[PDB]
Amino acid sequence: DANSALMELDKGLRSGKLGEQCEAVVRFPRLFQKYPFPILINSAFLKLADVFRVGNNFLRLCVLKVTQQSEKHLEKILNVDEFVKRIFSVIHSNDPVARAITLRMLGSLASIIPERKNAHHSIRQSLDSHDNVEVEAAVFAAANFSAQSKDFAVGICNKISEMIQGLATPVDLKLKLIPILQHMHHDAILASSARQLLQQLVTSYPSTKMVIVSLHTFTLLAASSLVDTPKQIQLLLQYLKNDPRKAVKRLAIQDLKLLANKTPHTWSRENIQALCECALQTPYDSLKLGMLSVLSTLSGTIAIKHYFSIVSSPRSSDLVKLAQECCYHNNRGIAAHGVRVLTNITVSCQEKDLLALEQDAVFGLESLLVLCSQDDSPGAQATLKIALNCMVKLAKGRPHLSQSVVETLLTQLHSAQDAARILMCHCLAAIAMQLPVLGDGMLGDLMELYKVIGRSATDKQQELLVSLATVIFVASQKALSVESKAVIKQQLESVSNGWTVYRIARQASRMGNHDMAKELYQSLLTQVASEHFYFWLNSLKEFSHAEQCLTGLQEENYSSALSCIAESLKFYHKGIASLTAASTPLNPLSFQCEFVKLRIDLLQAFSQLICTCNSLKTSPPPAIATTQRCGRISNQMKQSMEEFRSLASRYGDLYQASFDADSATLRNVELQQQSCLLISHAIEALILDPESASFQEYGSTGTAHADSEYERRMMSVYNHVLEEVESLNRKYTPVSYMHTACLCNAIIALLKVPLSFQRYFFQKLQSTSIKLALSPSPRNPAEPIAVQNNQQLALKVEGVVQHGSKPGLFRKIQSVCLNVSSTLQSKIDNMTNEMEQRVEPHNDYFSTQFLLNFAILGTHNITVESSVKDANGIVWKTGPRTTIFVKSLEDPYSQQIRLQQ
Amino acid sequence: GGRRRTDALRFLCKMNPSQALKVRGMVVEECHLPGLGVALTLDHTKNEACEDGVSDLVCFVSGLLLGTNAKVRTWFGTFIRNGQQRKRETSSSVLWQMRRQLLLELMGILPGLKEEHVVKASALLRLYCALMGIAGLKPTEEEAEQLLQLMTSRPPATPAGVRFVSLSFCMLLAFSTLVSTPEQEQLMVVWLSWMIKEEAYFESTSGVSASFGEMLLLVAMYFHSNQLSAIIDLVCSTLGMKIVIKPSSLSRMKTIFTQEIFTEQVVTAHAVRVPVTSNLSANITGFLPIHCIYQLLRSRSFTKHKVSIKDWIYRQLCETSTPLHPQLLPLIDVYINSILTPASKSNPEATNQPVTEQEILNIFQGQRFSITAQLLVLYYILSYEEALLANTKTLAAMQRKPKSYSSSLMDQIPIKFLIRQAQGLQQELGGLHSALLRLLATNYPHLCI
Amino acid sequence: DPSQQFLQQSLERVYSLQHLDPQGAQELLEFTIRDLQRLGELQSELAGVADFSATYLRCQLLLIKALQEKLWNVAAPLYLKQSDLASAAAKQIMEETYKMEFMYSGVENKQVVIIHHMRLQAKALQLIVTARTTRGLDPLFGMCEKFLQEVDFFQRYFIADLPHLQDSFVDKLLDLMPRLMTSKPAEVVKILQTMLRQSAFLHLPLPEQIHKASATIIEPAGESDNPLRFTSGLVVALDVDATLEHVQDPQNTVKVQVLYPDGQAQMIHPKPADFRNPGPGRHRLITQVYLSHTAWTEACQVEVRLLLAYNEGTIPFSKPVKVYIMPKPARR
Amino acid sequence: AHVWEDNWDDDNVEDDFSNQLRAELEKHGYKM
């Protein structure tokens, strides 16, 4: 049912009515989106071409619209020459509107035909014509060809130079033709000639209209040709300084904004001096906001480090004082830009005679905060965003200010409206997440604030409870008191949405407070109106129950270890039964089931290990026969090697097969895998061959990023276990009981730090899938493709990538590794044709050519695997795992020859 | 040796209570000895007293039968068939004692139905549907009687309750062999008669747009128009699994709907009396009063039974939004066909009157209304103007000419403005931009310059 | 020329601005890489020097990016095999050092000593990542011994030019040289980590006249849709004509490579007679490529690419071209 | 323009599963 849509819509195309043909033409883009493979694309584009050739000039506009929309599918066209000839057969017509439409189609088609000479001749001929629609379409197509072709660029450089300063072709047409000079960056002397022509134009037509158009053109030429961008930044400083007009100044602002966003390393010191000095003596306020917005975007990059470079007192520098009087300005936006600049100076380079500004910086934030808290307007909300981002960055860069930072924030958490409680709770959440030592310093104060929310408004209430209980969970780095649980619970019994309690429960499951997760999951379990959502909530409840059982541990007590581990396994198994029941074909929950299954396997590896440590106290030294490994305990810990190493491999396999998670979920998977490697190394350093260890951890054990509290406690446990392993290296007997005690304490230390269900367990932001439509003949089901067993099978695998939303949010596909293998299904098994190829997609397409050698006699099983390679370099093992069946026939002449031989 | 291995591992499970779930785990992930896993699950259920929520047995069988993996589904299914072929009376089999445990929780779930026990019984009905579906486990008389006890229960008020009664309706419609005695047939007649006179209360209080009443109307229309495949599709969509059902049981069920209870007049009246779905869109799933009224428009029964449609179509058009549902375009098409083409030669006058002038005017004065509604009404106006010029041989012999929409209102309609708006947002308005351009090209060369 | 002044100013900004946070150093390096590629694409007289500087700064960028890695934040047993990014970076910078000393035409001993020093840093990175991976004492001890004799070879062959190149990795490497002789290999690899952390970035004096070698296979173009048809087990000869510019000694260096669509490759050496010399700086390769296989079911795409060889290695320098090939069985 | 990068609760970061969960869960509006 792939070409059937093509025959249906082209049956629509063979009508004699304009309406049905137009309907089919405008229905083509949906069909393009549904099947993107180039057979259908090429066929439908040729049909669009020979519908375009004969038409009543309104079908032509519709096909132009479809070509404009479906630009990313244009490179998939195979029979390019017939397509372009059918389109080009309308230039020689005498209807000027049809000609203009066809030049617009050529301009749309520019990507696939950069160096077609007759197209350039048609553009040049129609460009100096007298019909206005033809002229405008010619300028459009000249702009679109000039971005790709170079000989067209130089010839049209001469032509457009002549027609701009030809003193005919009135000012509207000149405004239309200056972007032709914008697209004109291909060669050095071409760029220089365009630069001279633009300078002559801007000094020759000193208007409001032409100066704006010419300056935007001139800066796009500068940002395209990176050979004299500082000259244009310089020229923009004289245009922003010495020009009385206002709109020219506004373009100078947006121009310097674009140039600072693009190439900030070219900004020289005197350029920043000129920008700051022009920002001082301006009488207006919107212009002030614009220049200091440009300086704020310039302050977030390495331009400041070039500005504050050794070989004057930086207190006397223009930028810092300008930041001061615009941080203490009346308008809110200019204050936000100034406090961004001051925060960025503080976070950047650490010269001594800047440190006093630190004090100014922090006071600035709270001053701005008490201006923008009590306003309730979207501009004030954006000012809140900017201020709180500056608060986070300021506390991040200089931690010794940070404590003062957080306490000031709590003051404005006492008196502000319901839209200001949120995002301040978020700033507190971020600061107390990465830097935890301050979080407890809130504790109880949030309690009374939370009490006030018992009698607050209703419109923004639910999000506000979500934010407050989230920052409560973040701040409670050690645990939560029973009274804290009681007050949170009674408040959300007082009023709740039902989805708010779900968000609170999943926040608690994220942080590690699994008892309140239990209680809210009970509340959800009584609730809710579907099958698999009920099973999902039951599974989450059981996981919270097992994790409270894991929190109920005591150090140096192995009996409680076995008991609580058994309770955790039984609650996890009720939970994994619920998860298996909750799985749906529409939403095939795969990360959750694998994560829970490997968690179960980790705790059972721990259980077998702890009872194996108990086996030395539960068996003989060996036997009467043994009198360099003696006893069954050696074989048992070798099995522990096998289980833990396989478990680490399975954690790695779960890491590689996701590709759609965030940094935190991946880092948590890394924590679990590192726990498996930790226990494996700890055992193979104590009992199984101490002799060839000889390492004593010759790597760094400090100075970590510590992006979460769970990460920090994991790393502390890791370092403590490695310290115990280094100390107890080669002093004692190979079996020992300090060795078993070391394993016991290691297992207790790993199970004390609870767990963290991360973001990918609950919500999925990025969804990427691959198609891989195999076409040797695609078969049907059990029917195999017949091969003649004297030639190879040209597989011809072709693929396309499907993105759920926001194309690539976290990681971007750079190249894709297709792997193919065979298997003799008759019963190594045909490993002789394992093949690998790297693909770089153009827009979404994958096109490779695979030859498979089927040689022996039988039915073979082709499997195709995908492997995404990202921009950094990590390979990711996703893919549909496509399998196809082949039967190997023989030539009867060859069969008779083999029988005779 | 299968029974000796189950006996050995069962004694081991009794010996170590904690790792019985582990023995279940290996049974799952090597697909060996299903009866062993079920028996130890029953033993661990005997061990706990944690029966506050759903049973672990229910969750486990739901995971094995209705799961992402297929080979465990086939393995548990052939376990069910092997338990079915053990015809002689022997209580030592694991499967029948699992049936008694499910019977015990049937006893416990019975009353009408309680508020806390509303999703437990729906999950149980889905489980038993899977057992008689993919697994194919023919029940006994007492089990079928208690199934009819459970499905003919009274859900209190909940959206979980309307999910329950929809699942109970498809539970009945999937397996009509489950009822065998006349007394149970009187029981299901009483239950259906209750399910008629109650729909408005659950519809209003639950607030869902996917209630049971449109499903009742759908099955009435599909039996009335003799479309059994639509019934099969509806029950397979609502239950959540694909099960093949013989048409003979559905033919008996067709008789009990068409002869009594759902006569065609009361079906038409009740389908008129349904409310409209505010903020319709296409993101909501379900089966909907719009598909109900579209099916009742396709098989001509409104004007054949003297009931109006007009304000419903008006309100449903006026309460539409972004991405458009894939049913409104054929709904407007068959609405126009109902305006123009008469139903039968007995009443050539019999037709639907079109939308009044003032209402369309109040739409196009605005923005109070939605742009999807405006585009839909523009499509209605243009298609009515086009089709009124087309079916004119029947129009002249019909003597109740509904007439064009004057010219004052047609002057006060921005056609090019809404067509530009349709082109601007063509990505979510799919199926309407093409029709608007078709109508504009074939009827208005005013603006195709 | 504005381009020459811009290149000098950018290179001076790279060289001077090295006292930064590694985030800022990475940002400056990435911006100057993109600037240098854009300058090389725009210019043609100064394309070679822009590309040379871009390759050097790419090596420095990957070295710095590998230096700041989470691998040197956890211990050696806690290794993520799949999450490592610093392992392959040694191989890319090794291939890039080959690219400097064999792609570029006009070079003298200063460029040679700087890129040899960068190769020594590359081998140090490879040594430290392999030391972090494995646990066998004999392989790590052996690789330490090969690395120390490589350092010995470097100071022996370059016994001069140490006064001109200051405060580098190799200078103060030879300052602690006898202690590097007498130490446990774990002590050696930790002091090599500490050595790479304050290893200074060298300044590269660019040569006056440089040109980058490249090839353009003018025929076959590859856009021909018609297949080359022959019989299974027999050979077809496709004529290749390519233009070489700024290649020193093409006879012992330039080769042709054929990638069959089945994976197996062929490295065809050209004949010195078939090399033309159409002027001082451009050469014309005209040879015949010999192809044979065992019948296919449809005409497939065979890859043809010119490779540049050096002494023990081959690296690509030509745009790929593709040809349709149709091997048939006999009629009987 | 977002303060907290690892915020689980933005304006629209809710996947489909959470969308039908919110749809069937906000309707009841009562908790015991």
From Swiss-Prot, chain A:
| Record localization | Nucleus; Chromosome; Cytoplasm
The Gene Ontology biological process terms listed for this entry are: cellular response to ionizing radiation; DNA damage checkpoint signaling; regulation of transcription elongation by RNA polymerase II; RNA polymerase II transcription initiation surveillance; snRNA 3'-end processing; snRNA processing
Residues where Phosphoserine is found: 313, 775
Q: What is its main location?
A: nucleus
One Pfam family of this chain: INTS7_C
Query: What GO cellular-component annotations does this UniProt entry give?
Result: chromosome; cytoplasm; INTAC complex; integrator complex; nuclear body; nucleoplasm; nucleus
Nucleus keyword on record = yes
Keywords of the record: Chromosome, Cytoplasm, DNA damage, Nucleus, Phosphoprotein
By its UniProt entry, which SUPFAM superfamilies does this protein fall under? ARM repeat (SSF48371)
Describe the function of this protein: Component of the integrator complex, a multiprotein complex that terminates RNA polymerase II (Pol II) transcription in the promoter-proximal region of genes.
**Subunit details:** Component of the Integrator complex, composed of core subunits INTS1, INTS2, INTS3, INTS4, INTS5, INTS6, INTS7, INTS8, INTS9/RC74, INTS10, INTS11/CPSF3L, INTS12, INTS13, INTS14 and INTS15. The core complex associates with protein phosphatase 2A subunits PPP2CA and PPP2R1A, to form the Integrator-PP2A (INTAC) complex. Interacts with NABP2.
Identify its protein family: Belongs to the Integrator subunit 7 family.
Q: What is this protein called?
A: Integrator complex subunit 7
Source organism of the structure:
Homo sapiens (Human)
Swiss-Prot record, chain B:
Family per UniProt? Belongs to the Integrator subunit 2 family.
The species is Homo sapiens
- Give TM regions: 164-180
Which pairs of Cys residues are joined through disulfide bonds in the record? Answer: none
Subcellular localization(s) per the UniProt record = Nucleus; Nucleus membrane; Cytoplasm
For this entry, the protein name equals Integrator complex subunit 2
Residue range from the parent sequence: 242 to 723 of 1204
Q: What does this protein do?
A: Component of the integrator complex, a multiprotein complex that terminates RNA polymerase II (Pol II) transcription in the promoter-proximal region of genes.
| Origin superkingdom | Eukaryota
Outline the subunit composition. Answer: Component of the Integrator complex, composed of core subunits INTS1, INTS2, INTS3, INTS4, INTS5, INTS6, INTS7, INTS8, INTS9/RC74, INTS10, INTS11/CPSF3L, INTS12, INTS13, INTS14 and INTS15. The core complex associates with protein phosphatase 2A subunits PPP2CA and PPP2R1A, to form the Integrator-PP2A (INTAC) complex.
Lineage, broadest ranks: Eukaryota, Metazoa, Chordata, Craniata, Vertebrata
Curated annotation (Swiss-Prot), chain C:
Q: Describe its assembly.
A: Component of the Integrator complex, composed of core subunits INTS1, INTS2, INTS3, INTS4, INTS5, INTS6, INTS7, INTS8, INTS9/RC74, INTS10, INTS11/CPSF3L, INTS12, INTS13, INTS14 and INTS15. The core complex associates with protein phosphatase 2A subunits PPP2CA and PPP2R1A, to form the Integrator-PP2A (INTAC) complex. INTS4 is part of the RNA endonuclease subcomplex, composed of INTS4, INTS9, INTS11 and inositol hexakisphosphate (InsP6). Interacts with BRAT1; interaction is required for the assembly of the RNA endonuclease subcomplex.
Q: Where does this protein come from, organism-wise?
A: Homo sapiens
- Crosslink position(s): Glycyl lysine isopeptide (Lys-Gly) (interchain with G-Cter in SUMO1): 184
Q: Report which part of the complete sequence is shown.
A: 608 to 963 of 963
Q: Which domain of life is it from?
A: Eukaryota
Q: Where is the protein found, in the record's own terms?
A: Nucleus; Cytoplasm
Query: Renumbered to this chain, where is the cross-link Glycyl lysine isopeptide (Lys-Gly) (interchain with G-Cter in SUMO2)?
Result: 184
Record protein name field: Integrator complex subunit 4
Q: Which family does it belong to?
A: Belongs to the Integrator subunit 4 family.
Q: Coding gene?
A: INTS4
Role according to the record: Component of the integrator complex, a multiprotein complex that terminates RNA polymerase II (Pol II) transcription in the promoter-proximal region of genes.
Curated annotation (Swiss-Prot), chain D:
Key word Nucleus present: yes
- Expression across tissues: Expressed in limb bud, craniofacial primordia and skin.
| GO cellular component terms given for this protein | cytosol; integrator complex; nucleoplasm; proteasome complex; proteasome regulatory particle, lid subcomplex; protein-containing complex
Keywords assigned: Nucleus, Proteasome
Cysteine disulfide links: none
Q: What is its main location?
A: nucleus
Location within or outside the cell: Nucleus
An example GO BP is:
double-strand break repair via homologous recombination
Q: Which family does it belong to?
A: Belongs to the DSS1/SEM1 family.
- Tell me the subunit arrangement: Component of the 19S proteasome regulatory particle complex. The 26S proteasome consists of a 20S core particle (CP) and two 19S regulatory subunits (RP). The regulatory particle is made of a lid composed of 9 subunits including SEM1, a base containing 6 ATPases and few additional components. Belongs to the TREX-2 complex (transcription and export complex 2), composed of at least ENY2, GANP, PCID2, SEM1, and either centrin CETN2 or CETN3. Component of the homologous recombination repair (HR) complex composed of ERCC5/XPG, BRCA2, PALB2, DSS1 and RAD51. Interacts with the C-terminal of BRCA2.
Task: Quote the protein name from its UniProt record.
Answer: 26S proteasome complex subunit SEM1
Q: Which organism is it from?
A: Homo sapiens (Human)
Whichever gene encodes this chain, its name is SEM1
